Amino acid sequence: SKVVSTDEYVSRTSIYYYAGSSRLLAVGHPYFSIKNPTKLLVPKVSGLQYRVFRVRLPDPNKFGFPDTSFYNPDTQRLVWACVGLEIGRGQPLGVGISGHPLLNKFDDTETGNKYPGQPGADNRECLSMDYKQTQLCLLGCKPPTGEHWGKGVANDCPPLELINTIIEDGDMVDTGFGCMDFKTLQANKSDVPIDICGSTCKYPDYLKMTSEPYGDSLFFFLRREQMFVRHFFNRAGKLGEAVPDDLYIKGSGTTASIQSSAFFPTPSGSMVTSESQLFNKPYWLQRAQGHNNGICWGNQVFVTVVDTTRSTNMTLCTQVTSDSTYKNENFKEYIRHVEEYDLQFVFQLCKVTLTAEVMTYIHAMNPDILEDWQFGEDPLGKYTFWEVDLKEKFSADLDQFPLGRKFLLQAGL
Amino acid sequence: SKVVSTDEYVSRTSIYYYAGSSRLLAVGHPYFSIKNPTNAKKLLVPKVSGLQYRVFRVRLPDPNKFGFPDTSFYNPDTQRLVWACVGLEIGRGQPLGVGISGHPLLNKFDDTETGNKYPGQPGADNRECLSMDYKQTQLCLLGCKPPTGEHWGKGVASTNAAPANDCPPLELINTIIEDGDMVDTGFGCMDFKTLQANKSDVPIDICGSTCKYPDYLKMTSEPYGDSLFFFLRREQMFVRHFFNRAGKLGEAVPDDLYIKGSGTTASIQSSAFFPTPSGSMVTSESQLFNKPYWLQRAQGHNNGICWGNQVFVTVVDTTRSTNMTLCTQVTSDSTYKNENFKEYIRHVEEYDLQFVFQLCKVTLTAEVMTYIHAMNPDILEDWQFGLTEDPLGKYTFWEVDLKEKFSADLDQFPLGRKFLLQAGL
Amino acid sequence: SKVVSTDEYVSRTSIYYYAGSSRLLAVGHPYFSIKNPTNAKKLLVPKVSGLQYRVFRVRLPDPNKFGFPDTSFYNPDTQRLVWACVGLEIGRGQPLGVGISGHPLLNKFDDTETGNKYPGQPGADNRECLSMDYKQTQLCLLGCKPPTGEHWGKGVASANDCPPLELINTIIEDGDMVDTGFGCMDFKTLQANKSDVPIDICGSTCKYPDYLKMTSEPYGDSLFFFLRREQMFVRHFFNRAGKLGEAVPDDLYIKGSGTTASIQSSAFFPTPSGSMVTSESQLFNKPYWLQRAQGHNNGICWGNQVFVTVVDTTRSTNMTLCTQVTSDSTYKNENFKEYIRHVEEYDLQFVFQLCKVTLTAEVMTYIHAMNPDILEDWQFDPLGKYTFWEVDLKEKFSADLDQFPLGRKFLLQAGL
Amino acid sequence: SKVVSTDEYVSRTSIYYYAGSSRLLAVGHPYFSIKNPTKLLVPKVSGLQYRVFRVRLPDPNKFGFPDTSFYNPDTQRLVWACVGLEIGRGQPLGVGISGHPLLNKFDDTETGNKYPGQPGADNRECLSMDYKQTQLCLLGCKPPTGEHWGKGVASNDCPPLELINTIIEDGDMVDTGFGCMDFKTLQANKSDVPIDICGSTCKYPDYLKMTSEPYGDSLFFFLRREQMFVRHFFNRAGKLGEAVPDDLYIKGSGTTASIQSSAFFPTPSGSMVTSESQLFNKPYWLQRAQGHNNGICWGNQVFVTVVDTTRSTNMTLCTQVTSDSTYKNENFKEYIRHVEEYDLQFVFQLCKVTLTAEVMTYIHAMNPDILEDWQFDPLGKYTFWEVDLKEKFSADLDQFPLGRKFLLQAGL
């Protein structure tokens, strides 16, 4: 049908509630997960992962309100609207490093590699790098949609297909090598560092999400990406598509067999700073750009976050044997990464008058809304999200919490 | 039980006072303290580093025992007095500059920025002498309660059944930030002494220390808001170099992430990478200090009330971390000989705390006493003198005594003059 | 007594005057002065460096003896006149640029940025020829009192050989070295080997303005106002040769053996770098209008003199000069002599406002407490031991403001 | 005399005119000009040169106006006033490189040069660098005045330095990071700076002298933006003319017996060029000048001085001498060329001057040639880029980009 703003059929009340997730912690390995010598022994926790929080809200129609005289349950139903959001972030600012002990890096081509080139059977090197810096935040009542390139269906070069998937908690953000399925498009498992070489890097499909009719994916969003090229390398292996003859004059002797033009850069996120921080500050959802003005259908909200500005990897070191002199054989080296979150919300209570035209519109939009309201199995159960249960976390005492105090000043309340 | 703003039970007066700490100096060694090879537990050269927290415990005179010229502004039978902080400037001397830390035996193996070709040759001891500049940090915290920090330490492991791996379990620990504690430097906020056994993975000024980061989340969400009247912070860093560690790799790369090598690439190289930080450049424009802050409305419920007649000023300033090179001549000669000179390193810190305080009165009604007792009973204990030791003594602070430093002549001091223009008086 | 603003006992008139120093030039060697080899304790080539303080002592004509066209605007029986500074522009010539300092025999041992592998090779003399660009600094101070600086010197000797450090306040003189990235310390007395910092500071003292002390002095005669802009970052990471005076404690490392048996020097030191000079960050060649000072002296130039203190390293370019001793058809190093010279170009511009002071009994008591020399020169030089760049403006005052650049700007600013 | 603003004796009319030079192109070699084995074959065209345009205006007293009833030629004379200016710049942004195949560079002293030093007879190297970035714009009816350091009069072999003021001519070299000096006379070895300045003089605008001149004819207004940093640290070969004093260092021995050269010098770098930092391709409206001449173009001429290193890209050209199936270096010749594209746009306002006895006395004191040309070429020794606009004035302002902008600015 013709989509209308929620402001036309969802009534706002003066009832507000605060809800906080409290400290959220993830501790794990930044490059790979550790399996049980049989489930996960040590999870993969990286600053380059998507954090997709599925925040569960209490059903307002079954909520224990002190006074339920503000609406008529015979003809009306209740729904929460998000009006304030602050994403707390702990831990200091810092930059981590990823790498590969056997990266397919051949020669440094920044100042030039003189002829002749010597390509043996295995010239992989141990190289590491810092990734492209990314901060982003998405808010909606529907999980976010990402885009990435995978191997499609049919030189033998793989066909490229742009694939849309739901971004799950733990998915890898793009790091400077693009949003692609590195497992299926890079067979040697050695062209990108190990924390993505068997993974898929996804980029938010902002274009698709903003153009969807009802606007359930993006109540609003913020994003800040930056990177530059730090080093200039080339690949080892057969060059799949040779340079055409009309683009160069053939060499002779030392320059007879041409060198590999399969170049690749290493990225660098440059500096992280406090002023460029997107987080630890409130966002007030006054007017969404989509038609859904922050209405949390189904009593759930999705907060999607990427934050590489706190990607420091901690070095842990144990001593196996105590000796009076230093021996490398006496110590084991470990790496660990942590993430500290604290989600804060301010919700506004809303009522929906269920006329025949309103029920028809809602049924077109989403039939499950009317069934859950008991009027006219989780399809998202196949996906992985960070569940945040706030059913027992709602409070009407706004000024007893930081974001609630800010909301009272913002709305002048 | 329901926390309310101090604006509801603390009455403001038109009485203002200035107080200044005058020059505060700390001179010492930036990497370690030097102990006395003799009694008694005293220090020859203290550890003074630009990477340290400065936690000042500012003692204020008890206004209930203060010699006021006219005490007709309140009723001591039913009321009590307390100071409220309304103005603060953190003076900083010495020029801007950046210091450097390092380790003569740092566990640095290979440079992996442009790649390290195979094979790698790891002998018994490949430690090198390397140094670096740290992440730049400016921050300042103000409250009537000492600040709370967070860092990672060694926890306890579940040993049932058998050991999963010898990697130490990590636990997030909250402690009070004491004067002299090390700020995070780019290697995280952790207990390096207990989590890095080889004493050689980070420079020596933190390798036997704990780096702490302020638990801003915990401090702002605590109900009464006595820790943070306000705060300012400015952090920046980038990755300068890319290295890897020597020693046994505790957790090997799984097989599905690479195709095994052969010959030169048979023994995989260490993927225990680590960066060196860099705070980039310090500039005058980004300075947090040497400017006044006016505390008009705090975000917490404590609107600058200095309970217990004390204030905590927490400062980190790495923008003046210059380490001075000192050089003595042992033997006089006409030609240069390396053994005729001794090389020393010293670091200095120059502070000057300035405040403007507002006198306040509290009426001890039945409702006020019930509330204050819930919040903090020690407030009512210090007030009570008849009817009808140090809880923080176990911690180390830079004591700043202002009991004899309060002055009512505001226009006679720099911050007092600024306050008069700001408030229009 | 209790200090009050000059606004309470100094009356302003509508009489304004312009004064300009015209072009001021200093030409010399940036690293050291060249003294006379025979028959003289005078200098052939002065030390002129972009890292020096310029402290101008500006002499103003006594307004009480000034040849005014009509002197009926005040009563000489009960009043006295004094100049107040209301406008200032510090003109700077020469293009923006960065100079370089160094030391042919600097105590640099190894580069410790990517690591120095063991073992270390400490011979008898490993000093190297090294150069660097300094921390960038712009600052400007204005007062009727010479500026006060701070630096670290050798203290009172009072269980090791490390010198005790003492914070010293001195008057900043014209030609003193500003801090360059190694701190404000007496390098001649605190670094005996003369080889830890470049030669243009290794036998000098670097001073930093004691802003805290100057702003806290009661009358506020030192800083009518000030501007400052400093920046630097660490460019390189080195360590020192020589005996390590204070060894690393044993609990901070596990001892090595064989190649790593003899521990390396942890006496690290950085080289600074001022990054870029830009037009946007220039403090100079723009006017400053002194409407209300933060101190109690609101720009009143007691003693008919003003001190202008400037540091500007954004024009520290050192020119390379090359002479040909023998003309030859091919290039030979033995035919040329290499010289280095540095120049500084200033142009001080002022707008002064004439003021009168009514000498009542209460005012005379206050002024006498503040400064007794003020009332005696009125009828109603301990600074000779210091070195300043004397700027004589006694014959440079003009009331025709619109005939000069700063004067035209002032007329537009105040709407006159 | 006593100088007064032109607003006091020059009356403004509501008559405005547009004038544009159209495309201005210069193509040449960025390091040196090429002369014939007999004129000029290839001029020296570099992004480090001053462009000084001498703009000729039509004499308004002899201009063909449609209606001349707005003034009395018996008692008045006409003059143009500049009220709008835009300096059009074509070609993309980019940075060029200068160098010297035989530069007097000895050792790299950035991380240290270990002893002993090996100073042979000729240790010059082939080195190149990017220069200090400079954007500047000057406007007046008098050519600009520059400053540079030259050899003074001798009164101990260091040359005496003297500060010299000259008129900046089109083609003069701006300072590049080595100062504003006469490199031909102050650097005898011809190898201390790159070849495009080593036999030239780098000049810097004498802003102080021009702003302090009484009538203010050189600078109606100006804009400037300079930036640079030190990229590398070197030292010079040759005899050290002035040795380090003995009290500043402890004598060496053995390998460190013979001290190394402390004749250090930096290489500059202009860092990055950006669209945001552009001074050009935007209009400047001359509403009130800081000098007393408020944009009055005495003598029917205007001088526009421009420096722009943000388009200093040098193009590499390569010809093929012999066709062969494999690559051989001797079969190709390598050339270097640089280009500059300008487009000067002006908006002029017609003004009338009533020549009373007081006004004529003032004008004659200021400049006697003004009244003589009014009937009521001293600069032939200098080189300028001549811009003839005598046949380029148009009263149809809304037909041109700058003219449309002016109509919006003044609300006309």
Residue numbers in the entry:
A (entry chain B): 19 to 56, 60 to 175, 183 to 404, 437 to 473
B (entry chain E): 19 to 406, 437 to 473
C (entry chain D): 19 to 176, 182 to 403, 438 to 473
D (entry chain C): 19 to 56, 60 to 176, 183 to 403, 438 to 473
Task: Provide excerpts from the study.
The native T = 7 HPV virion can be mimicked by an empty icosahedral shell, called a virus-like particle (VLP) which consists of 72 L1-only pentamers. High-level neutralizing antibodies elicited by L1 VLPs can block HPV infection; however, protection against HPV infection is type-restricted, and there tends to be little cross-reactivity among HPV types.
First, L1 proteins of HPV33 and HPV52 were cloned and expressed in E.coli, purified, digested by trypsin, and crystalized. The crystal structures of HPV33 and HPV52 pentamers were determined to resolutions of 2.9Å and 2.75Å, respectively, with refinement to Rwork/Rfree values of 21.0/24.0% and 18.7/23.5%, respectively. It should be noted that the surface loops in the non-crystallographic symmetry (NCS)-related monomers within the asymmetric unit of HPV33, HPV52, and HPV58 might differ slightly in conformation due to their intrinsic flexibilities. Then, five L1 pentamer structures representing two groups (group 1: HPV58, -33 and -52; group 6: HPV18 and -59) were aligned to compare the structural differences among their five surface loops. We also observe that the surface loops of types within group 1 or group 6 have quite similar main-chain traces, with minor differences noted among the loops between the two groups. Notably, five of the nine HPV33-specific mAbs (C2C3, C14A2, C16D7, 9A3 and 7A3) failed to bind to the BC loop-swapped mutant of HPV33 (H33-58BC), suggesting that the BC loop of HPV33 may involve a major neutralization epitope. Analysis of the extracted cryoEM map of one 5-coordinated HPV33 pentamer and one 4E5 Fab revealed that the 4E5 Fab is bound to the outer rim of the HPV33 capsomer at an angle of ~58° to the pentamer surface.
